[PDB]
């Protein structure tokens, strides 16, 4: 009689044929390029795109002036424009069908860290966002699966640096009484 939720859902589809030779290549360039840690993030993105496409391929099944299609396709294009993939001049529900995987990977924040030149490499990115060195719009960010608010913003808010001066004691204050007073003098 407890008061809980009981609601979860998987978000990655293992494929059907396991050992195609050509898929492991394209699904290796989509790892070595955007600096990923496994294949689940790939399957997770392709399934979120399949959800977008299959809903659109249910609405294009409908005639014009469908009161359902008007509300749903028009708020769908709002949900894609505000994550900034389609051109806002191109509010027209035929360009959804020409939408590849890279339209979300380019909008990952790990690439906008590489492209905004606020880093060195791509693999230096995940170590930044691990080490609490950035923020977005005065809100600290810890995750490279955070495409959010396409109108974006940079770092930092407030962080006082002292990692090695507040490290080894200036490299000065250690040699006072260590093997010096108790030996020769």
């Amino acid at each position: 009689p407890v008061a809980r939720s009981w609601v979860c859902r998987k978000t990655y589809v293992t494929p059907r044929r396991p050992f195609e030779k050509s898929r492991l290549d394209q699904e290796l360039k989509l790892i070595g390029e955007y600096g990923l840690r496994n294949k689940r993030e790939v399957w997770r993105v392709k399934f979120t795109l399949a959800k977008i496409r299959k809903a659109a391929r249910e609405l294009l099944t409908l005639d014009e002036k469908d009161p359902r299609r008007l509300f749903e396709g028009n708020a769908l294009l709002r949900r894609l424009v505000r994550i900034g993939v389609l051109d806002e001049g191109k509010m027209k529900l035929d360009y959804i069908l020409g939408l590849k995987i890279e339209d979300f990977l380019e909008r990952r924040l790990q690439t906008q860290v590489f492209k905004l030149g606020l880093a060195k490499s791509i693999h230096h990115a995940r170590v930044l966002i691990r080490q609490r060195h950035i923020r977005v719009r005065k809100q600290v960010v810890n995750i490279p699966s955070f495409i959010v608010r396409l109108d974006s913003q940079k770092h930092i808010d407030f962080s006082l640096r002292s990692p090695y001066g507040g490290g080894r004691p200036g490299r000065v204050k250690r040699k006072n009484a260590k093997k010096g007073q108790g030996g020769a003098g």
Partner: protein, 55 residues
Amino acid sequence: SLARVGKVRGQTLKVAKQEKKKKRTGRAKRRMQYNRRFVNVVPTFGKKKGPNANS
């Protein structure tokens, strides 16, 4: 027969295993794999071997 039990494993030549550097894991393994496939090497001549083809 039931009286030849454990002949070969009992009578192989036991050699100690080696002791070397650990293999990088995580994304760094995937990165080294990306590094040995596309961006640096070219198809040189004739067929393409396997990556273990010590022949």
